[PDB]
Amino acid sequence: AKEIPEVLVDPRSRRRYVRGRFLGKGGFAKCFEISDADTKEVFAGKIVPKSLLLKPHQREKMSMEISIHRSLAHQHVVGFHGFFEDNDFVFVVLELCRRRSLLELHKRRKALTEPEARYYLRQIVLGCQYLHRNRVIHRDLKLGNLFLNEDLEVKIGDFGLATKVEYDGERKKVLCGTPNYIAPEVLSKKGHSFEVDVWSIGCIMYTLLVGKPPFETSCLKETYLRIKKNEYSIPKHINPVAASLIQKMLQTDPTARPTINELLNDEFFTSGYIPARLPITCLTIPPRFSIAPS
Numbered sequence: 125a126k127e128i129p130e131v132l133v134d135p136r137s138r139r140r141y142v143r144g145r146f147l148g149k150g151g152f153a154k155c156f157e158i159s160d161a162d163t164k165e166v167f168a169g170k171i172v173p174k175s176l177l178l179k180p181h182q183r184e185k186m187s188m189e190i191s192i193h194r195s196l197a198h199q200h201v202v203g204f205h206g207f208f209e210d211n212d213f214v215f216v217v218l219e220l221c222r223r224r225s226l227l228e229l230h231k232r233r234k235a236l237t238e239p240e241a242r243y244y245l246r247q248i249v250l251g252c253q254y255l256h257r258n259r260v261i262h263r264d265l266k267l268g269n270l271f272l273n274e275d276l277e278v279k280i281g282d283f284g285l286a287t288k289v290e291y292d293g294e295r296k297k298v299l300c301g302t303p304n305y306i307a308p309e310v311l312s313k314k315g316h317s318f319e320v321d322v323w324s325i326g327c328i329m330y331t332l333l334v335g336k337p338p339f340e341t342s343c344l345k346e347t348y349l350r351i352k353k354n355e356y357s358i359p360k361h362i363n364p365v366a367a368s369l370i371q372k373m374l375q376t377d378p379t380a381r382p383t384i385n386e387l388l389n390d391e392f393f394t395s396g397y398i399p400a401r402l403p404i405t406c407l408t409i410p411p412r413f414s415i416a417p418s
């Protein structure tokens with residue numbers, strides 16, 4: 125039958141974890157609230173069964189996710205706190221992001237107010253900067269991969285398609301899997317690089333402001349065509365300041381998009397209100413950002 129242990133023991137560090145509430149199925153994995161029985165400290169447990177890792181291929185991707193994620197630590201990247209295995213499962217101990225992800229927030233709120241976007245996008249961009257500085261391309265940035273903590277801060281996660289750039293000006297040919305906001309130079313298949321993540325962010329931005337993905341069609345393959353044909357509309361009701369930024373990020377030619385270190389310098393940010401923090405109410409009710417209470 126092959127079920128998951130009630131206590132998850134790491135024989136290496138002698139840390140023991142108590143399998144808490146079930147959070148969901150993040151792909152090949154099942155995810156649980158897990159607490160260290162010593163410090164009582166609470167984490168998210170990514171538990172993936174080895175039965176689904178039978179092929180060395182599926183297996184190397186898991187190892188790469190780990191290898192990459194463990195090397196990273198930044199305010200806007202999901203805290204990676206450890207990993208281990210028994211005979212049947214792989215356990216990964218990650219930062220518990222209690223306010224879920226921008227996906228759930230998007231599904232409750234749809235389109236966001238401009239400062240909220242600015243707020244989030246800034247954080248997305250920063251984490252991503254950290255990644256690119258470390259020669260890491262996420263390659264699968266989407267609302268579901270942008271996790272929110274207690275303070276509504278963005279924590280980039282799931283490095284399942286992440287990759288290290290091993291030398292200057294490398295062009296990665298293969299992408300093993302299918303992202304949401306997948307870049308046109310991936311499908312054009314003459315290589316791809318960092319500018320893929322920028323593209324993704326272009327689509328994230330659009331989505332946050334418009335309330336829907338920029339391409340989203342019935343067919344997946346349908347959606348794939350208009351990506352490489354560059355075919356999307358920006359609604360009238362969207363401010364030009366924002367729309368320009370989006371247009372700059374959603375260019376088919378990768379080398380036209382801004383680098384990650386360029387973005388926060390865009391008019392959209394530099395001449396717009398970026399909140400210092402968000403109210404919790406922002407998960408349900410659009411904030412107006414008043415200047416004084418009553």
Ligand SMILES: COc1cc(C(=O)NC2CCN(C)CC2)ccc1Nc1ncc2c(n1)N(C1CCCC1)CC(F)(F)C(=O)N2C
Pocket residue numbers: 146147148149150155156157168169170202218219220221222223224271281282
């Ligand atoms: C208490 O907090 C949560 C609550 C719920 C929550 O309320 N879930 C409800 C969903 C609907 N069911 C019916 C009830 C629980 C969901 C997620 C939480 N938190 C969380 N933190 C971190 C991660 C994460 N989640 N990821 C998500 C992806 C999808 C399934 C977990 C998986 C992950 F792999 F651990 C990961 O990498 N990260 C970065």
Ligand SMILES: [Zn+2]
Pocket residue numbers: 299300301
């Ligand atoms: Zn593959």
